[PDB]
Design a protein around this ligand. Structure first.
Ligand SMILES: CC(C)CCC[C@@H](C)CCC[C@@H](C)CCC[C@@H](C)CCOC[C@@H](CO[C@@H]1O[C@H](CO)[C@@H](O)[C@H](O)[C@H]1O[C@H]1O[C@H](CO[C@@H]2O[C@H](CO)[C@H](O)[C@H](O)[C@H]2O)[C@@H](O)[C@H](O)[C@@H]1O)OCC[C@H](C)CCC[C@H](C)CCC[C@H](C)CCCC(C)C
Ligand SMILES: CC(C)CCC[C@@H](C)CCC[C@@H](C)CCC[C@@H](C)CCOC[C@@H](CO[C@@H]1O[C@H](CO)[C@@H](O)[C@H](O)[C@H]1O[C@H]1O[C@H](CO[C@@H]2O[C@H](CO)[C@H](O)[C@H](O)[C@H]2O)[C@@H](O)[C@H](O)[C@@H]1O)OCC[C@H](C)CCC[C@H](C)CCC[C@H](C)CCCC(C)C
Ligand SMILES: CC(C)CCC[C@@H](C)CCC[C@@H](C)CCC[C@@H](C)CCOC[C@@H](CO[C@@H]1O[C@H](CO)[C@@H](O)[C@H](O)[C@H]1O[C@H]1O[C@H](CO[C@@H]2O[C@H](CO)[C@H](O)[C@H](O)[C@H]2O)[C@@H](O)[C@H](O)[C@@H]1O)OCC[C@H](C)CCC[C@H](C)CCC[C@H](C)CCCC(C)C
Ligand SMILES: CC(C)CCC[C@@H](C)CCC[C@@H](C)CCC[C@@H](C)CCOC[C@@H](COP(=O)([O-])OC[C@H](O)COP(=O)([O-])O)OCC[C@H](C)CCC[C@H](C)CCC[C@H](C)CCCC(C)C
Ligand SMILES: CC(C)CCC[C@@H](C)CCC[C@@H](C)CCC[C@@H](C)CCOC[C@@H](COP(=O)([O-])OC[C@H](O)COP(=O)([O-])O)OCC[C@H](C)CCC[C@H](C)CCC[C@H](C)CCCC(C)C
Ligand SMILES: CC(C)CCC[C@@H](C)CCC[C@@H](C)CCC[C@@H](C)CCOC[C@@H](COP(=O)([O-])OC[C@H](O)COP(=O)([O-])O)OCC[C@H](C)CCC[C@H](C)CCC[C@H](C)CCCC(C)C
Ligand SMILES: CC(C)CCC[C@@H](C)CCC[C@@H](C)CCC[C@@H](C)CCOC[C@@H](COP(=O)([O-])OC[C@H](O)COP(=O)([O-])O)OCC[C@H](C)CCC[C@H](C)CCC[C@H](C)CCCC(C)C
Ligand SMILES: CC(C)CCC[C@@H](C)CCC[C@@H](C)CCC[C@@H](C)CCOC[C@@H](COP(=O)([O-])OC[C@H](O)COP(=O)([O-])O)OCC[C@H](C)CCC[C@H](C)CCC[C@H](C)CCCC(C)C
Ligand SMILES: *C\C=C(C)/C=C/C=C(C)/C=C/C1=C(C)CCCC1(C)C
Ligand SMILES: *C\C=C(C)/C=C/C=C(C)/C=C/C1=C(C)CCCC1(C)C
Ligand SMILES: *C\C=C(C)/C=C/C=C(C)/C=C/C1=C(C)CCCC1(C)C
Lengths: 227, 227, 227
């Protein structure tokens, strides 16, 4: 349940919070209309993360699901968070690399399903079924990382070296990080309880802050966001 | 409840699933940026349909509402599905016919209300009230079919004959199909139980697959989607 | 609970309803593509307000939350309403003043959090915690009114006098009205029950109709919406 992992939630809330502050206090006097978009998209990611992390800390984002012949502590707020933050991150990559509206739409769709599926899985009562939803969700995820890796990289090659390189870093960071989530989910309390909610929460915490604050940092501190 | 209609759900899940596969395996090597958009929008429709049909089959999308002095089997997942798939379909028509942003916005709004209202109706406990929500939802629907029929057709007349004709087919197919839903809802378990959930599910199944896979087929196999 | 304030809900439902009708019956024969957008955005605001007000009147939008060592009557539908209507209103201001996509995105984000936070607050069981969420929600709100007041006004100064002035009126009306909500929430049943749900409902009613129908009226009856 929620108590031993109260601390990881606390640190997460705080890190996202400061992350918002730092990104907010930096894009204040930014004239560049394109850079303006990047700060907006990027800043909104940690801000949302902050509200959802606070709901877990205060006990709201946590619920109980019966499965495995018992009651289970499921932090649902993660899906509420990700549902918006993942597309926003994706949007950042698309703008940076000037992707086609079609692909953005396809990418956003894939993402919504990825989280939608993950959320449903996290709540389904037939233990067994939770793993099907996981399968679907991961399939959706993989599609995204594919397009990002082979599709987006290609589009980056046409931009100026600054953008190509920043994208390369961002690309590597999201591909590697995003794929850890399904592994954590799988071995955590949402799936086979191989790992305690204690460590799991510390894991999502590190992954989230990296995948958002870190990503924001890499992106917002490069000249790539400028026209 | 969910058992006698388990089969229609199963076939639906499967048909949507293959529908996604087929549309996915066809727009792979498509350079045309406009055609790319059409495949994205269209492909996402059956994909969502698949996840929601699977939730009904696995028992998740089903809930119980007390009304009529008794418990009632309400597949809520349909609204979760439609909420996204109906606008997407609408968006397809708008792109094809190059509609004004204003009308798209108005059309999307109408749709969200149409489903939002339908969902609320499906869940309201005062039997009587379910019919008011139905009224509102249908009113919203009618507005949409109106704009599609008289507004969009007009905009199609300015496109090349290929587009005008494909739109005509699509227009006829959506106008006729969409209007069956409110009739099914009305006579099914959501309203006056004149028809059993058994047949009702077989009905939504046929309507959905036609309105999505069929629509996708008609659209994605014409040269209308190209610039 | 829901009974003594049944009337304010009834009048609200009716006022929004007519508000939709009036805005609908006025933008019918409007060729101007820009004006078309304004009518669409603006008309959808009261229309949504109508469906949510009807849910409160019919008893659906009302729920019960335990806090303060007792059961509490919480009209949740307000958040469902606002979640969409507030951005739409914001979008109106942005179009009118031709704001940057970045700022619109930032503004929409802030708003979603503002309502999301408000909703969570309205539902949190630890009385005490409801006030933190209020704090966050208001902080988000303030950010919005700031950008609207100092940012948007600046952008209005570049438009023709008609637009600058209409915006000025709209700006003053939203800044003043929006800031009353957090005060009402604070002193109403969602926070410290200093004011009865009776008067509270009459308050939100006046604020809503003004902030939407009034706003719509001021905007839709000026030549500012034309190109
Ligand atoms: C952009 C649009 C305008 C989009 C729409 C966005 C929105 C709708 C997304 C929602 C997304 C999904 C993923 C989240 C929902 C998950 C869902 C399955 C879980 C829902 O449950 C929580 C919900 C309601 O809370 C509850 O109220 C009901 C009514 O009164 C009750 O019937 C429920 O039981 C109650 O649940 C709570 O309490 C439970 C407590 O039980 C226990 O009690 C015992 C008593 O002895 C003891 O105390 C135990 O300890 C205790 O646990 C608990 O178990 C439950 O979990 C629950 O807490 O909550 C509503 C959440 C709200 C929707 C979150 C919003 C997220 C943030 C703010 C979003 C910011 C987004 C903006 C929009 C982004 C903008 C950028 C774009 C432009 C890209
Ligand atoms: C784009 C944005 C980023 C937009 C936001 C999208 C999202 C928020 C939309 C939601 C839309 C609405 C329409 C769906 C919600 C309907 C709502 C009224 C119904 C909610 O209930 C289900 C919800 C939660 O499940 C539950 O968990 C709670 C917390 O722990 C519990 O308190 C509930 O009770 C529990 O409910 C389940 O179980 C019930 C079981 O009871 C019974 O138990 C007995 C025991 O003996 C026995 O077993 C009985 O047989 C059994 O029934 C059951 O009755 C309930 O129905 C329920 O199953 O679920 C969350 C669903 C999730 C939000 C669905 C998402 C849909 C898909 C994946 C969307 C893909 C969308 C992308 C975004 C599209 C992209 C394209 C655009 C760009 C255009
Ligand atoms: C654009 C996208 C495509 C975006 C997605 C939009 C959508 C998902 C947004 C949702 C936003 C949030 C803010 C609203 C949800 C708030 C949430 C916390 C509250 C949820 O509860 C209500 C929910 C389900 O109702 C219930 O069914 C469950 C399953 O069967 C049950 O388990 C619940 O208990 C049940 O709750 C009801 O009944 C309770 C009754 O208890 C009591 O019973 C006793 C008996 O003796 C006695 O009778 C008592 O008097 C009685 O009270 C009650 O307490 C509960 O409150 C509840 O009524 O409802 C689903 C609502 C639906 C999602 C509202 C939609 C809003 C409108 C139509 C939106 C129009 C939007 C379009 C999209 C805008 C377009 C423009 C853009 C382009 C900008
Ligand atoms: C659906 C349909 C295809 C299955 C029919 C199975 C049939 C033999 C009946 C037995 O299956 C019965 C059902 C429960 O339904 P019930 O009415 O409660 O009984 O079990 C549940 C059955 C399965 C566990 C769930 C269906 C599986 C989905 C089709 C999942 C697919 C997962 C990934 C997305 C696959 C990616 C691979 C891609 C590249 C091809
Ligand atoms: C049981 C199952 C049936 C159910 C599945 C579960 C499912 C719900 C989850 C999957 C997610 C799914 C929702 C995703 C939908 C995607 C769909 C909307 C995509 C539509 O398609 C949009 C395109 C975007 O195109 P581009 O990449 O940008 O190409 C640019 C080119 O260089 C030209 O540029 P120019 O114009 O300037 O000249 O997708 C990108 C094109 C790519 C370059 C090519 C991609 C190929 C695919 C990866 C392979 C096809 C899929 C496989 C046969 C199997 C399906 C697996 C599933 C996991 C995807
Ligand atoms: C609202 C207001 C207009 C009605 C006031 C009615 C008054 C005589 C009081 C009796 O009505 C009392 C209420 C319950 O409220 P309670 O507090 O529980 O008591 O019954 C419920 C009353 C009604 C069944 C619900 C109100 C109806 C909506 C106004 C529905 C309209 C339906 C369609 C969208 C109409 C399209 C036609 C358009 C072209 C004009
Ligand atoms: C109790 C009730 C009060 C509550 C009602 C319930 C309600 C919640 C459900 C209804 C759905 C509602 C939410 C829909 C909102 C719609 C609103 C946003 C629309 C705003 O309006 C946007 C326009 C889009 O314009 P266009 O069609 O594209 O015109 C192009 C022209 O050719 C010029 O081209 P050029 O620029 O190139 O020169 O709507 C299209 C303009 C059309 C051509 C004309 C349409 C006329 C209407 C159908 C008639 C007006 C309505 C009726 C008086 C009664 C209301 C019934 C209700 C069912 C709509
Ligand atoms: C989070 C972290 C920063 C707080 C750690 C506090 C530490 C001393 C522990 C005591 O605090 C314990 C927690 C409950 O957690 P539990 O596990 O149930 O025990 O109380 C709940 C603690 C607080 C009531 C909630 C945290 C507060 C948020 C950080 C709220 C901030 C409000 C506004 C958005 C501020 C705007 C000002 C801006 C301009 C700087
Ligand atoms: C907080 C920021 C980000 C980038 C979060 C990303 C989360 C994911 C990519 C989650 C993926 C999931 C999969 C693939 C399947 C199991 C369920 C998850 C939702 C955890
Ligand atoms: C799955 C694909 C589509 C095109 C589904 C369309 C569904 C509708 C048009 C439903 C309309 C409804 C009305 C008009 C009123 C009763 C409730 C419904 C939601 C069933
Ligand atoms: C119906 C139309 C509008 C413009 C409604 C606006 C509502 C708000 C600005 C609400 C703000 C809130 C704050 C700042 C904090 C407490 C909770 C609220 C959601 C009431």
């Amino acid at each position: 349940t929620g108590r031993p992992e109260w601390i990881w939630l606390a640190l997460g809330t705080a890190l996202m919070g400061l992350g918002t502050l730092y990104f907010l206090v930096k894009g204040m006097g930014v004239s560049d209309p394109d850079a303006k978009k990047f700060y907006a998209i990027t800043t909104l990611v940690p801000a949302i993360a902050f509200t959802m992390y606070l709901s877990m800390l205060l006990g709201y984002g946590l619920t109980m699901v019966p499965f495995g012949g018992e009651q289970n502590p499921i932090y649902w707020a993660r899906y509420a968070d990700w549902l918006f933050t993942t597309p926003l991150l994706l949007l950042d990559l698309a703008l940076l690399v000037d992707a086609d509206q079609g692909t953005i739409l396809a990418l956003v769709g894939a993402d919504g399903i990825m989280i939608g599926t993950g959320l449903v899985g996290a709540l389904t009562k037939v233990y067994s079924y939770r793993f099907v939803w996981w399968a679907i969700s991961t399939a959706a995820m993989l599609y995204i990382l594919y397009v990002l890796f082979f599709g987006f990289t290609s589009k980056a090659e046409s931009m100026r070296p600054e953008v190509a390189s920043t994208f390369k870093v961002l690309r590597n960071v999201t591909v590697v990080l995003w794929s850890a989530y399904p592994v954590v989910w799988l071995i955590g309390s949402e799936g086979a309880g191989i790992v305690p909610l204690n460590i799991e929460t510390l894991l999502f915490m590190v992954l989230d802050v990296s995948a958002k604050v870190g990503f924001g940092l890499i992106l917002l501190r490069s000249r790539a966001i400028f026209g």
